[model samples]
Target: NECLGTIGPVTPLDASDFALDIRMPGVTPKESDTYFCMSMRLPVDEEAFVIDFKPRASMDTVHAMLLFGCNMPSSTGSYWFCDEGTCTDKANILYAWARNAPPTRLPKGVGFRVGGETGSKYFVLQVHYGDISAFRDNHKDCSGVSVHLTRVPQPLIAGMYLMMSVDTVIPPGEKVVNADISCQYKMYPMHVFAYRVHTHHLGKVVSGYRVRNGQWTLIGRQNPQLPQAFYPVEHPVDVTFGDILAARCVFTGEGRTEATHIGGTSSDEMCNLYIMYYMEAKYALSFMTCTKNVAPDMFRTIPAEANIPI
Candidate 1:
């Protein structure tokens, strides 16, 4: 069904409209720069889309991401230490944020479809607690995301492609460091709508692009040092098979006399460019990330182990 895009104010989704509201179990974080993962089984079997998302805590929660189609065993605990690799197959990065941000308003006719008797039956919420060493034993955190869902099936489905590298290294005293990566879309066609760039402290500039017919086209560009949020595309770009999606992350090492590599903690550095788009397909194994070792190939499928570090 086709619906006209909203022009003026849009009403937010209420708590009663949500079919699922999963949160991290209460816990007192110890040590500095720690991370935790909590998984919850989706309550319903109908396909639904996210309408609104609210963070439960502000100060202690540095960043959080929701993952779908995880390959964790049935014996997995409700909460565990999962700094990475939660969604193995069709690792859908549903929503992500850092520090404190406002509720994400998805474009009209687009929604993150979950649980239609297919794809991910489980959902994992990964939270990063930066510098929680100062908290005493009595202090506890129940910080999590209050996700609102809509049973109304929208016409388009949203998917996110994470373009990142695990072998990034920035030398100390180097004025500039650049990491470049490229991946292919072997699945259905996707119309680029929104993009978000991410990096640690050292990142200065980041950009994403689409290469079709040996021609390069700009997707989005911004300084990673600025606030990380989804930026809507002024004009939606379409891409299909045989097209290359590329990203470049630029960093500057001014003071520290050490090299920074891809790691999880706040002290470590990262290079990621998240590309969000809409497609007609309900789900696709089109999610892929490139590393320093793998070369870009549009028609071939690179194993997940080759792209992501262990």
Candidate 2:
């Protein structure tokens, strides 16, 4: 839990201690430009938090880092934590539904549509994966390729969701809202399910919530570095609907950036909330598990218009 506050460099691990590290993209379900970070221990730090792992069961490790920025150019502005590794897939591009061409073709990770405001409200989203492990069963067979494979079977981890909206138009500079989302389920336990948010570049933040006690409680928020890319957070909370929840946007003109609220779709650009659906909430919970070791199988589908399973 304290790892959330860790900063800077780290050391490596040793034998006798078993460990695992999974590389996850911090892309939110919806494509928004916001700042979101996950609290984690530096995997490569040797002395900072050493694990006595046997060399025969261990292999050199690598981490993945994705850059989401609103100021960078369309292409060639992204960065990764390792030069030796690469991404196998990237998100699909979104086109303006009715907005002008001036903000058309939502860049790889930016959007401008539906509810965009010049200075007040914008959306940002992303997700991050935490460490995984099954210490007793497979710590000995982790050498070379086997080690990475072993990591695929653990179900324990913690995550955080960061959401910020810049309302630049409201006043010279203002701090509208900053939130963190965390969630978990009770029935599912062995498959992986993905959650999502939907929005154009004009958005600032996206979130999911359940209702409670005649009031809407907030559950999760989207925090992406890029203008339109999605950020995903690990599971850690349960659900209930007295939680009527909705995410708000603070346009660049909606708030102040000179002090702590220093983020925007562009230098002087504003914010808005343009989204179509809550992509993260459409999954069948009976099928997916919040843990990693759980294979992404064990799910079933009922055709559209099919009768419900009772």
Candidate 3:
């Protein structure tokens, strides 16, 4: 299935369709456990939808890649280190992938808006290279992303609502440590179709929910050690402007006796959740995310009658 597009019963995408290869020019990564980002402008008409994303990279050299939609690009040259200036203005993740993750495909009538006054005018691709030996050997990678776009007026515009917690500090010895994050959805009605969970090895379970009227509705839950691909939500959940969203990751302490702080390295821990959704509006949310060191007693606010997971 080379073409991973359309769930609305439309024709699946093929190589014949327009595709853009936003790849590195065979540039050699300068450091280890670092990310290299490239900037490019999109040649799209108004109301275009980016429907599919195929990540191109080698598993041995690149561990993950993230595509960001930016309103304004950084003053830096075409490409630079991710730790440096990425975008002078706001940026949002249009697509993200990790090891073993599959390509991104939107369902029928769902597509990410681009090439308009309010849409993304530029994009940035960040690739993570953690292999010291590969970069030391002058391994120049053309790693990047292949995007399939269309000018069709998609009824629903797709977007990703990211929920993550960076103030994660897991103590050693005991078990049942939970990291949490929460926020209020300050946007119009949007339907969540799929969800993906990300965390380091110790993660036992990660869960997300939509809270309204003191009732909690499960969005999705999974063990972060899995493929990290977007799994279809069994039941689509509607999120309104005032809806409260929350997530929790339970990590078991066992392997090491030292306290683990949250970080980007493979040895550290992370609690990230990606919620895929679509809005039937003129444009998608300019920015939608929930990040924190740790959230308040959000779990206690969950109503006893609401549905939940372990």
Candidate 4:
């Protein structure tokens, strides 16, 4: 399924809608000289993302890839940044980005982190077409085909853009472009290793399920306060395309702003939501036990199709 440009569920193909000019409304070619873009938003200090950038198969000229991250952290001279790792406790919000291969001219490693303080957290990640290899490796004129990370001070919302371009051809010329962007969180002091998801008093929690026939059941829950408790607290749920695996959290108070943030800082409320899926009979018993009497439309249910990398 090509996740090019329709809504979340409307997968695309062949880079047919290569230019996401509509998603950004009035983004001009003059402002940034950037012709294509795909954008989405996630809450900060409390929420995480599960992005998938599956490129169209018909367009081999396109350079398919993904880049992801949250807002930057305060500059207290701490190392809360990661391009290929996780953050926690003193590591607070995690700030990083990734792609399938390496790029050219990148800082030997070009990711980001936060170092300031505010009542809320917000960040914007932009993905585009161009030669990441040349930019990261050869240090060529890799302008249009790069991602830019911007940090805004003051109250703002955190968001990211999924980008691709059909500028070059691949091996045998099978249409190529960015695939999916999956979210992964690192356990802090807890060292809990598992997929993470969360919600505030409003967003109770994110969950998963197993699908069979036309019925749905339970799998797990995302407990932000306790990483190790995800499987224990998150009961197994059955699911189908119609039976959505949800990530729900209803607000109890307006004091809590649901913007997106990255990893960083000391004493900050470092929220973590892991997104790694795997399939096996290893946890069959756990799955069987968790889904007993579990319903379909439960807490923050994620749809079956969204379950990737499993």
Candidate 5:
């Protein structure tokens, strides 16, 4: 009654054009920096494609929002406090928005398959509100996203392959620090379109590549300080199963006095690389992540093509 007024009164009888808002409403956020979560619901009886996303929030009230496609989600209507744990089952990051970053619009033939018996069984919307006064004065927020769906089956199914590090440490007073990781892909052929690289202020260069039979193909390379949106790939690479996906983040900790490590906030350093792709297979990979410690084993596998000017 407070937020959604006069709508949703009469349930529809037939299938019509639909625009859904998967948001958290009728609630007040009180924490300065806290993550609020709720189950994102889609059409239960049919299949659809996530064609586009539009964020609905203000920067002064909300910090960032991330939507995850999970194989299993919690019960609906229960907005749980989830900062540490996001999904009960394996999850795939679908869309994320922050300051100055734009919404995601899939290519013509690609879409995220959801609903029915295919793709991700459930979804989770995680919202981070970072305002002290909004918490004190009982700030009411309906922050989330508006999604556009299309029932038309696209030829390519969309998904995200994440490459990140957990136990990475960057020492201070170093000219260049790197966290390079690698993992094997055991799925079918995938067509990669865009890539998103993430890091703190210390990151200078981040690059991702695909290696097959000792052959290297650059996926995407960019400086982390630029707009954090997914950029178009220089060349679309068709990756197969037996291939190895690798990434590297080069950081310069010259002026810092203390050692920087991996954590959540801006104070603590973090490293991440997101690969957005689509597949022609009937079923898409719900979750595929490559994680490893910061070492020199596979870093040597990356050749000189990763070095490029921002």
Candidate 6:
């Protein structure tokens, strides 16, 4: 599972892989809440494929995400602090993980295109350190992700799509609260092969669906308690123009005195759905996410007894 290579008769090029690392610059974080980020640039100009991923310093590393198409100065070095909503206009999330996630291999014959004439050249790596003071004893550490890339002229390119709600409000003592987002696909046809759900401790059930003519079809469902890894779709879901893609997150806060909203840290909550797909033609876009903050008023699905927290 560590090394991922080509599938067909085409032999993958050797020694073409490159590694990019980002560390915390030997700072022992004394605060319990520490979110750090760093950026690096890819020097190559060929088609690249990420074959393997390895995360470092498991104890303090909350999560890590790779950013592509960054616009930064060449002198930018070392890890830096970044807000959750701050990223370059052309930036896109290449990969992400939280907790102790195992290394992932991209789908067969498909790889993430990077450093080509039109692909992303500049990159950024962001890592969240939760309760760094606890690990102060071993403070001098290199916590980052090692991305393995290979130069290959792949026909099909893989892309990551995200769907989540920024406004997740769950009243205290409520048994169930749902946050949903729906959108139509305007791009070319996509065949989704993998799906993953992300939530904090309060999340119970998360599901994704494909909507056509108002009819819903289940794509994947999972409990966030399980291992946070990409779950392969039982069947490839075909999405075309005007097809609606929807995601719903169920949360339970039965014994609380206040409401909870979406956040980045572990103490806070998050509702996210990641869909990995591939297309015949390599689009200029590397990632796409859909957001529908306001669910339509046509559905009165929740019980009236779930009152707002005072």
Best by TM-score: 5
What tens digits encode model 2's per-residue C-alpha lDDT throughout 188-207? 22121122333333335444
Candidate 5 lDDT tens digits, 198-294: 8989888889888888777889888988766677776688889888888888888887989999887667887789999988848576456888633
**Which lDDT values do the candidates have, in the order given?**
0.65, 0.24, 0.75, 0.25, 0.75, 0.66
Residue 273, candidate 3: C-alpha displacement in angstroms: 2.2
The RMSD of every model to the true structure, in order and in angstroms, is: 9.1, 20.1, 6.5, 21.0, 4.1, 6.8
Which consecutive 10 residues in model 4 have the weakest lDDT in total? 283-292
* 72-105: candidate 3 lDDT, tens digit per residue: 7775586788767668786777777777767446
How many residue pairs clash in all the candidates, one count each? 0, 99, 3, 77, 1, 0
lDDT of 6 by residue, 1-310 (tens): 1221233112333577556554345655555546566666675666677655666555544554434445452335465566543354646555655566653666677767777676666666665666554575664545656666777566777887789888778888899898877777878888888888888888887787777766666777878766556777887898888877877788898766788889875557888888888877455346788878444542244322222221
List TM-scores for all candidates, in order: 0.71, 0.24, 0.73, 0.23, 0.77, 0.72
Ranked by TM-score from best down, the candidates are 5, 3, 6, 1, 2, 4
Q: Candidate 6 — what's its lDDT?
A: 0.66
Better-scoring candidate (lDDT), 2 or 5: 5
Candidate 2 vs candidate 4, lDDT winner: 4
Write the residue-wise lDDT of candidate 1 on 1-310 in tens digits. Answer: 1111343112344543553445556666766556677777656667656655655554544554444445342337757776554655545566666554443566777777676655456777777677654465455565666666677776787777788878878888898776778867677888888888888888877777777776667788877776676777778888798787776777878877788788867678888888888887465432555554234453134222222221
Which residue pairs show backbone clashes in model 5? 30-135
Error of 3 at 222 (Å): 3.0
Clashing pairs in 6: none
- Which stretch of 10 consecutive residues in model 5 shows the poorest summed lDDT? 8-17
Best by lDDT: 3
